[PDB]
Design a protein around this ligand. Structure first.
Ligand SMILES: CCCCCCSC[C@H](NC(=O)CC[C@H]([NH3+])C(=O)O)C(=O)NCC(=O)O
Ligand SMILES: CCCCCCSC[C@H](NC(=O)CC[C@H]([NH3+])C(=O)O)C(=O)NCC(=O)O
Lengths: 208, 208
């Protein structure tokens, strides 16, 4: 089946976990503690010396987006045709770029860079509002009318930003409706409210 | 047909151009000058306010890797099955990570960070040597036995690093043989030697 090996944080696994849950998939969690990591053996065995590590049968993967695209490909959450598949990538890549800046703020300079980051947020979120406005008035999903791996990843990005800069979505009616709508999906709602998600820290450094 | 809109540099378009050339595809180049860019109109029309921008018929794409995956998907350079498609992603993601550090060195702190970067290079390149050693002794491609978009992207990464730290591939027999082998492909060889590639600067800041 599925197995995700990662630290005891949401981080780069939050989105794929949401995906697995909403799709009614069963998976195993292998928690890696800082002590175990600092031992060195696991780090060395990891291709790019990092986690998350994922296992699907005897297929061992690395790189969060690779896991997302894999599930998306295998579970049919990658658009209805090639054109949509490309637009799904365009969204995910955009999500990835903003996630990098978020991760850099959280770990590199939270105290001094928080104010500038928040001021720049509207411009960074705007593109997703625009994408949504061009797809059935943003009443369905980010691309096409069926959900895709990019939705789960975007949803996480928006959620974590709500905690960082509460109210950042008030200026974006479509994104706000989008978050609420998807968060309400039965399997997803139950997952987001469970101890498995709630009691895990967003990032590992105690900052959010 | 195909149209790539980008600045007069190789940068994030080098790989997709190599892909187009080697596959015998025709494309149009729309060169964007700093003056045109600083005018503002084009920047605003771009989804994430950035280039490269790509057009395939009336399909308008953004994000370099999205263009690579698109060509890969449409041209059959994405593995022979789902498993390979996932390994192709794992490689490309790895290439992307290292490209980001390269881009950060080139634009953020070349003078002070060049020495530390080069020292760390072997560890960063090693994973690709390892991947190659596990695939038919690294005698064919990075994943499977047919070429994929990840090859073109990896090939570029290696080439640009040869200029940054000449000889960095001497410690990696498989990667070196790989670069030479692919650079020798007829259409690709002719492209790499043409004025269209040679007279374009790698990055835009005059550093390499
Ligand atoms: C301690 C709690 C905080 C954990 C933060 C998240 S783990 C961060 C880091 N992993 C990554 O950055 C993964 C990046 C990779 N590109 C992906 O998308 O999967 C890692 O393994 N780092 C370990 C290392 O590189 O030594
Ligand atoms: C002047 C010559 C130097 C050009 C350097 C390359 S262009 C850099 C930048 N674009 C990107 O970083 C693209 C990143 C995007 N994630 C991708 O992969 O396509 C840009 O458009 N920047 C313009 C802007 O953001 O204003």
């Amino acid at each position: 089946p599925y197995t995700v090996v990662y630290f005891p944080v949401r981080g780069r696994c939050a989105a794929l976990r949401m995906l697995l849950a909403d799709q009614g998939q069963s998976w195993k969690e292998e928690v890696v503690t800082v002590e175990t990591w600092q031992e060195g053996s696991l780090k060395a065995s990891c291709l790019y010396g990092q986690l998350p590590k994922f296992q699907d049968g005897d297929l061992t993967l690395y790189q969060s987006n690779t896991i997302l695209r894999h599930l998306g490909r295998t579970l049919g959450l990658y658009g209805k045709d090639q054109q949509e598949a490309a637009l799904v990538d365009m969204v995910n890549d955009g999500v990835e770029d903003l996630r990098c800046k978020y991760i850099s703020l959280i770990f590199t300079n939270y105290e001094a860079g928080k104010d500038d980051y928040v001021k720049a947020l509207p411009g960074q979120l705007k593109p997703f509002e625009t994408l949504l406005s061009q797809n059935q008035g943003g009443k369905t999903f980010i691309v096409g009318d069926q959900i895709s791996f990019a939705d789960y990843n975007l949803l996480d990005l928006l959620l974590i930003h709500e905690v960082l800069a509460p109210g950042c979505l008030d200026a974006f009616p479509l994104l706000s409706a989008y978050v609420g709508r998807l968060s309400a999906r039965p399997k997803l709602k139950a997952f987001l409210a469970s101890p498995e998600y709630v009691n895990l820290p967003i990032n590992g450094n105690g900052k959010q």
